[PDB]
A paper describes a structure:
Mixed lineage leukemia ([name]) family enzymes, including [name]-4/[name]-2D, SET1A/KMT2F, and SET1B/KMT2G, are the major histone lysine 4 (K4) methyltransferases in mammals. The [name] family enzymes share an evolutionarily conserved catalytic Su(Var), Enhancer of Zeste, Trithorax (SET) domain14 as well as four highly conserved SET-interacting proteins, i.e., [name] ([name]), ASH2L (Absent, small, homeotic disks-2-like), [name] (WD40 repeat-containing protein 5), and DPY30 (DumPY protein 30). Importantly, we show that the [name] core complex docks on the NCP through concurrent interactions of ASH2L/[name] with nucleosomal DNA and [name].
In parallel, the cryo-EM maps of [name]-NCP and [name]-[name]-MLL1SET (MLL1RWS)-NCP subcomplexes were derived from the MLL1RWSAD-NCP dataset and reconstructed at 4.2 Å and 4.5 Å resolution, respectively. The secondary structural components of MLL1SET,33 including the α-helices and β-hairpin of the SET-I, SET-N, and SET-C domains (dotted circles), fitted well into the cryo-EM map. Similar to MLL1SET, distinctive features of [name] and ASH2LSPRY were also well-defined in the cryo-EM structure. Importantly, the [name]-MLL1SET-ASH2LSPRY subcomplex did not make direct contacts with nucleosomal DNA, which was experimentally confirmed by the gel mobility assays. The catalytic site of the MLL1SET domain was outwardly orientated, conferring distance restraint on substrate accessibility (see below).
Numbering used by the authors:
A (entry chain C): 3814 to 3950, 3954 to 3969
B (entry chain M), C (entry chain I): 12 to 118
D (entry chain A): 18 to 331, 336 to 354
E (entry chain N), F (entry chain J): 29 to 121
G (entry chain H), H (entry chain L): 20 to 101
I (entry chain G), J (entry chain K): 37 to 134
K (entry chain B): 32 to 334
Amino acid sequence: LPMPMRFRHLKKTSKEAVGVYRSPIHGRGLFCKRNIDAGEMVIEYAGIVIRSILTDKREKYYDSKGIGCYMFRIDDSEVVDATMHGNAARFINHSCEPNCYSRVINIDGQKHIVIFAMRKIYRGEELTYDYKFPIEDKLPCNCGAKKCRKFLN
Amino acid sequence: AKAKTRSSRAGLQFPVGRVHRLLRKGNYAERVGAGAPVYLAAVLEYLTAEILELAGNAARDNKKTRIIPRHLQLAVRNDEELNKLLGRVTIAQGGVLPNIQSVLLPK
Amino acid sequence: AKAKTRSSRAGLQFPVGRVHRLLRKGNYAERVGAGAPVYLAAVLEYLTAEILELAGNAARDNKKTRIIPRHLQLAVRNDEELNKLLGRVTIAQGGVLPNIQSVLLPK
Amino acid sequence: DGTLDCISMALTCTFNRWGTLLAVGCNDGRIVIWDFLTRGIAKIISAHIHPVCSLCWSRDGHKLVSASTDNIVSQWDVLSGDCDQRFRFPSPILKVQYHPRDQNKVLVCPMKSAPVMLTLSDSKHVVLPVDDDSDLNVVASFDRRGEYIYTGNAKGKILVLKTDSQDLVASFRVTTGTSNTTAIKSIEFARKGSCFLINTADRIIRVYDGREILTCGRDGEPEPMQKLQDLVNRTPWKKCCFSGDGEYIVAGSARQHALYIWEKSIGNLVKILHGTRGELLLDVAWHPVRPIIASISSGVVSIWAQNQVENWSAFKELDENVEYEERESEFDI
Amino acid sequence: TRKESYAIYVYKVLKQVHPDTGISSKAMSIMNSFVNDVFERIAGEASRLAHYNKRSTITSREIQTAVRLLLPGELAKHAVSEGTKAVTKYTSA
Amino acid sequence: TRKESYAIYVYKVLKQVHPDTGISSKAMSIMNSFVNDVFERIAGEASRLAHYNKRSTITSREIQTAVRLLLPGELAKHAVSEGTKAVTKYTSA
Amino acid sequence: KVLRDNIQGITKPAIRRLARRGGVKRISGLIYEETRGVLKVFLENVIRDAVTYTEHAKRKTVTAMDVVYALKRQGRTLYGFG
Amino acid sequence: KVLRDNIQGITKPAIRRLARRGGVKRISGLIYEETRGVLKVFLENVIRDAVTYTEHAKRKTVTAMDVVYALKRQGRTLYGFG
Amino acid sequence: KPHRYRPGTVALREIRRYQKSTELLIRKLPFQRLVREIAQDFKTDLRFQSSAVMALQEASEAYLVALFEDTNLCAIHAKRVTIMPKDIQLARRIRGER
Amino acid sequence: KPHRYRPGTVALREIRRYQKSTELLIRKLPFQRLVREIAQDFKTDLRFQSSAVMALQEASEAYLVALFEDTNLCAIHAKRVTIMPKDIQLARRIRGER
Amino acid sequence: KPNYALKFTLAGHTKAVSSVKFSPNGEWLASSSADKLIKIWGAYDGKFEKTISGHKLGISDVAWSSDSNLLVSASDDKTLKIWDVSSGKCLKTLKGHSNYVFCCNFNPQSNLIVSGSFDESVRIWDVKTGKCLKTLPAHSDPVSAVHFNRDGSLIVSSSYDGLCRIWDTASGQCLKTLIDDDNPPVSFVKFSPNGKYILAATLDNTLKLWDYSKGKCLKTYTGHKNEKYCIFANFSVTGGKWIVSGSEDNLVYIWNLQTKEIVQKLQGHTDVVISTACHPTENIIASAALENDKTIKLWKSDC
DNA sequence: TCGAGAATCCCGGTGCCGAGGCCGCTCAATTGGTCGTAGACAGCTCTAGCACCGCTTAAACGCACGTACGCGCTGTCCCCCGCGTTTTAACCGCCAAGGGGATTACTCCCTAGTCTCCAGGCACGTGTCAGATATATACATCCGAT
DNA sequence: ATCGGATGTATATATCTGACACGTGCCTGGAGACTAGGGAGTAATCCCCTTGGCGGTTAAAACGCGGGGGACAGCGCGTACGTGCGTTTAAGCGGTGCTAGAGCTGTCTACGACCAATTGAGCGGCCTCGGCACCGGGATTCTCGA
Ligand SMILES: Nc1ncnc2c1ncn2[C@@H]1O[C@H](CSCC[C@H](N)C(=O)O)[C@@H](O)[C@H]1O
Ligand SMILES: [Zn+2]
């Protein structure tokens, strides 16, 4: 399956593959509404693709509104920012033992941040991936798994 | 001057006069040779002889006097050279000679 | 008594008189319609132009001024209608157009 | 997608003039008016002792004509629940239908006899004419405005009569693919315009325009506005209907207990809603003002909604990664 | 319409080879059409041969060569022998 | 011994289509043989058809029917259009 | 009287009967329609040429002789019809 | 001067070259002689008819035109030789 | 207790009796309607001799029998008893019908 | 260290250049001697035009290429890349050459 | 500029008044308080009709059925109760809300009941069976105001989290979320008489009239005092088109509808005017104040 | 693995229409002249084919060897065969209206055939450049260690 | 999944040439003009085959329904075959030489063409009856659980 074709099939079936419910981890969480096998696309982190140089000025700007900073680093140049305009992938919870993993795949010359399945996910499971956040000096992780880093950082 | 048919002097049953007429009207040559219709009529008679012989053989083997197209089909597919002559020829009401592949047999 | 050939009177290249004489000496029918050689030569001219167009196209595609038989073979094989017309026809120095099945290419 | 357990022995269903109540025939011979918003029964009327096989709503939504299996046809008010009138005729009735613009007139398709238009004010009955007088099985229905009556026989004939005069204003014989004749299973109409549909015994549905039918007039050659069928499974349609708007056509597969929804403009299948294989699909209806579908099977009512992206979706929501057009004064002060 | 066929001659050669056997008019017409087909074959190939030799008189030699072209092996051999014998008989008188 | 051919006409139509493109002698012979073959095909078809109609005259209609029998689709379409144009120009002489 | 989609008139039992005659034991379903297609394909040629002959015959009906000539031109001649 | 067994003159590299031209990657050995056979089979027909034409031509040498006519009669005509 | 033959056995006997029998295996009227539907595509209002359409139908049937035969043989070469549409496509490809 | 290509790769390039090239692939004199040996079987002392035998050889080569092509395709249908003589026999059987 | 003068002062609720609602026939007024009781009063003369008791905690909101015969009371006991006004008997008891129900309202057909609670959930209930028909986590704060639209097809909802959320009813969709570019706690909200508009009372001394057909605020009403309590507002269409609202400065403000200018100031209350009810047919305003007043007052204008 | 059961083969018997035998009714085969001509044959060239022989060398045969596809086997799945029941429309037999198919009878416009003339085509010389050939070169791609 | 090296392949160039485009004189097929006849075109008539419809029957098709049977997947292994590298062989060029037989021209004569006169072999048409198609029933033999 071509990467653009699989991305299109994700965009078509993600809505019927992901849900948003009450999260035992943190607030509102993404849940697996139907068995998600490994390798299959779970959900794209949709949002405004800005440049990383635009993050800070936007970040400070978002500090003026106090809205949740929904930013994921595309690469060393761009960042998907979904604070005001994004998708349900904002509400995916960080997980130290993630059944999902983040990638940035190219589609016809545009990089989309897609969370794929690290393992076979099953119906009812809260869809969660690893934010890949560096070590800070500490956001506690409520994944409930076994190898929790005791924090998001 | 009594008129005997040319087939009589040729000792054949197929009408050599009709043969030569069909030749002259078929636009195959400016003029047809004298012995050419006799020759081709003899060839045709021999072919018919072989074919109907095999046909009657098959019919008697099937306990039948009347020859139906099935007998002709079976006779054609039963002889090699006849088949090769008529492989590109479909036959009406002929069906297929009974033939079953090896692997199809049970065990 | 003005001289003007039927090919000119049709504004075509193929000799209407030559093909008419050939049909006369070909023994296909007692008489021939006068416009039939014209029509036939026109069809031949059209199809010849059709084939040689693709021929010269492949030739200049190989930077070739004079067309080679390989070019004609490639031309007739690429065209669907032409190939269907000449599927049961082989060509001297024709070769075969490039054709590789899927699984032959390694992975 | 929703179901109704509070209803037992459900056989037939029909929306009111607005899509607010559902009249259900109970096999014991009762009428259950189930209400939508309260999600409960609005009324219960033990009409007769024989099952109810046909129902229809009044324009104001207050009169309900019902046909029972015992040749009985009776009218009941939605408030009083009393027998407004009760009649009996030979050749048990197959269908009753209020005149959509006159709640006095009512068409009646019986089993063997020709359909008859009655009135609930006076006990009269005008029998509709039939082409061959030997079909013995003819469906008939008023148009959307009760202006005409379409009659389909068992031999693929179609007679469009003037409901008041019962006289031929249009006619044509329908084929059965090759050239054959077929039993006209049903003549259905839409709540909008003249776009109606014909279900025949050939498992094929033909959408037509009644305006064009009148255009061809007597013995025309009209082609169907649309052609629908189970081209993959070759399934006969126990029932079919339009949508509330008329751009969607639902067909109930009792052969496999599914619901195939096509379009009208193009005719392509919108989708398919699959019910359980064990249940025998009986009746189908569309919510005239909602993309919801009610189904009746083995005495059970099932709901089939068509919901939107909402109920949580409304920050702002987008679908794909939006490349922000960096303004020329982005980094500027 | 006097339509010409070979049915009587087919019956004749039948009695010559199989005296106590019947036939079907359907199979009869089949044999007739076969006769016509092989006949037009031989005719076409003989004519084309003479054309290649630029001849205009289809004679016995052309017939024999055409049979050699069309029939495989011993079929053609026996056919050629029969044709030569019939030609010899006809020319003997 | 003068050997007739069509090479001059092939060269002519080639120049009429591709004035710059050349042609090989062997390729020219291939083209000539091809024309001979297709012409023989259509001639035999026309003759057989006229025989099926018992008409001893081969006219344009026979040619049209033959080429429609022989060429696949748009080939035959363009062919019959060109032939009709040519025969009309010939009649208007 | 306009005819349509009678290709489905070719019943699956008929196709499997033809296969049995051809000596086939087990068959997949996906064959049938393909068969139909191929059948049509075959038809799509001969019948056309048929009317073509009929066309040149200036006649309105098709003659058995015409389809015999068609199959002859298609190298699949048949016997028993003149 | 009597000739014999020159069918082995068809070298295995030649057979595999023909196969490569036909688009074949891997081949078994048992093909080669079979190939030869088939080749001969093909030959066994055409060449014979060839001399047959030459026979009717009352000539001693074989003409390219003759084999063209043979392939024509065998439905495998060839272009480029008259 | 009810009895059921092992698979194919009934089909094998069917093959035997069909190779034995010689009648047609396709219902006449549907085939004729198909022929008329195909004919109206090239020209409408074209009549047919009964013998003509019968010959059409039988020639097509025999052609299909030959196709079934060589496709089944090819499937044998494919080491399978169940034919697959790719096998028929391959056979047509070999027959020069593609 | 000496290098050796993986199997078939060289053969694949051979296929490419051969489909590209157009000359003959059989040595002339052996083929001509074979033709003479076959001819002497039907009649001795039969001469041949050089162009005649050349046309023989090239037509036979092209026929063999077609046979190789459809046999290879049949072998693909047999799920193998290596041709087997049964495949060639099957192909000939389909071509009506048996 | 109306001239609403005080005709009758209605008192007797021994605790903090929370809601007064004129009966749809204008014959009765249902004064609710934190005393677990409702008081039915003569809406034309301040005649104390009766007291309906039975609740367990303070009744935060009360609402009439669309036929003046029934009354839904949402009490701090986390329960609702539907009482027949003509008899006082508790015809229905609605249990299931896990927290303080702050708002209750009927649909235009009186067949549905919408209830927003402290549990941040809006629940739709039957009236003939009283069963909870639907439930939604509507907001992130206690829902204090819920109201059907002009026909019952849509429900506007208000909570302390500043969201003005309009929901679909036939399927429960959060259709719109009106925000005024800030987060001021919107204590009360209601549709317009024509249903095209929506009045939202925010806890910053502001009444925002949005065009619901457009989804943007059209009119602003400021100058009153509403910062903590869920002050109820009224439209005046029977007489002069006014916007009436209680206030936390013992005053009942009355602005003009179009010009949004203060056209009258009904003083006379001594405490925060907790609730206001407009007569459905007459020019009678029932203004009720909180515990330091515990009085309702009828005001009648002549313009 | 010996019976039960089921599909089949054959035998007698029934009634039928196509096969066949026979009948008037030709036109197409036969007979006989007569004539123009196809080719059969004689007899000449010359050339293309046949074979010789030498020299060069790409090309063929065989080796060793790695290796990977063919094959053989396994377990799974599904799926098509078999059979029973339910449906239907093909078929069959009949009737009927007509529209084309076939036919004959006229009528003539076109083609074959003849003769005249010349002009396009064709064998035949002749420069001449398209590409065939060869070399050095830069680019593309497999293959293996990492 | 990558880079380096080897090798194989597309490129530019030089020049050589030999097919190839071009031009000629001379021939003959093609055009032009004219005449005959009669194949083709048209018309009016009959038929009859077809196309269409109708009612009853059931054999046939559709649908469904287990379920054992094979498609197919993967996996071990090993034989058979690609391949690079050896070797040695006839393939190819070419050039010579001889002539046998194609291939040519000129007879001259037998040989169908053709037409005319004659008529019974053959063909549409009419009885007619006997192998044959069908039936039903009883014995025969395959096949699936022991
Ligand atoms: N694994 C985790 N455990 C606890 N909090 C988390 C978490 N992953 C993300 N979060 C918090 O959730 C926010 C990301 S949105 C992640 C979904 C979250 N349940 C929600 O309703 O918003 C971040 O601000 C972070 O503080
Ligand atoms: Zn974790």
